[PDB]
Structure 1
């Protein structure tokens, strides 16, 4: 999705990098989630279910903790991250997979934004699925 080596090695879709691309902004919760998801080192608290753009919060409290760090908001927690996700519902960005705790799914066209398929990305992260 980029020519130059606009900075290397680790996570596939660095939020800091996607901000500069996809429109702009001071990092948005959903962008945060995409980043963590494209980072093998994070696959123990959050990850792809294997089904399309759907994912799971293996450790919501750990995901939360991190989110807080990114936004410099020490008081963050699952309660608030959750409602955050709940806020995305009618903006057609994130939807919650009924009958399952901690599992959600991006519903915007990430393929158009990311330039990859679910499976494409999945492979690159070595998705157990």
Structure 2
């Protein structure tokens, strides 16, 4: 409905694409649609970030199966808040959300480490991808 001194939407999309954004292997919205889970849930959002090459500086696979690390916990929480429109979201609430998945055997925390968790549900059968395959697509060593 209006233009800025510099940069159209086409430019915006191209610039983000060049930064490897907007192409997660496992988009949360699509995954929620596939499972009919309704509104996006935290574990699905984490999978989207983990399969989005542009997010590797703040959340990444460790290379061991479905183990991952929140390199920058605050940034993960900020993005979750933005996606769900929850401005009060912070690491505190994020971590509580992660601990909630323990009992449900969806995500577990790695002992002896900090900020390292692991999906423990059968994502291979759900997604159709092995961790090794995703690591390869995302250049994880």
The TM-score, its normalising length taken from structure 1, stands at 0.91
Gaps of 5+ in 1: none
Mean Cα deviation higher: 116-125 or 22-31? 22-31
Cα RMSD of the aligned pairs, angstroms, is 5.0
Q: CA deviation at 1:101?
A: 1.0
Structure 2: distance between partners of 1:40 and 1:8? 7
Structure 1: distance between partners of 2:17 and 2:114? 40
What is the SS of the residue equivalent to 1:101? coil
Pick the structure with greater CA Rg: 2
Structure 2: distance between partners of 1:41 and 1:16? 18
Q: CA deviation at 1:24?
A: 2.0
Structure 1: distance between partners of 2:15 and 2:35? 12
Q: CA deviation at 1:99?
A: 1.3
Structure 1: distance between partners of 2:16 and 2:107? 29
The TM-score, its normalising length taken from structure 2, stands at 0.83
Gaps of 5+ in 2: 1-13
Structure 2: distance between partners of 1:61 and 1:3? 22
Aligned residues of 2:22 and 2:52 also touching (Cα < 8 A): no
Aligned residues of 2:21 and 2:52 also touching (Cα < 8 A): no
Q: Following TM superposition, where does structure 1 have runs of at least 4 consecutive aligned residues deviating by more than 4 angstroms?
A: 1-9
Going from structure 1 to structure 2, the CA distance change for 1:107 and 1:11 (only over 3 Å counts) comes to same
Q: 1:78 — aligned with what?
A: 91
The answer to whether structure 1 residue 2 and structure 2 residue 26 are counterparts is no
The one-character-per-residue Cα deviations of 1:68-123 (angstroms, maximum 9, x if unpaired) are 11111001110110010000101000000011111000000000111010101110
Q: CA deviation at 1:25?
A: 1.6
The one-character-per-residue Cα deviations of 1:51-72 (angstroms, maximum 9, x if unpaired) are 0000000100000110111111
Q: CA deviation at 1:10?
A: 1.1
Going from structure 1 to structure 2, the CA distance change for 1:49 and 1:63 (only over 3 Å counts) comes to same
> Looking at both structures, which has the greater relative contact order when contacts are Cα pairs under 8 Å and sequence separation is at least 6?
1
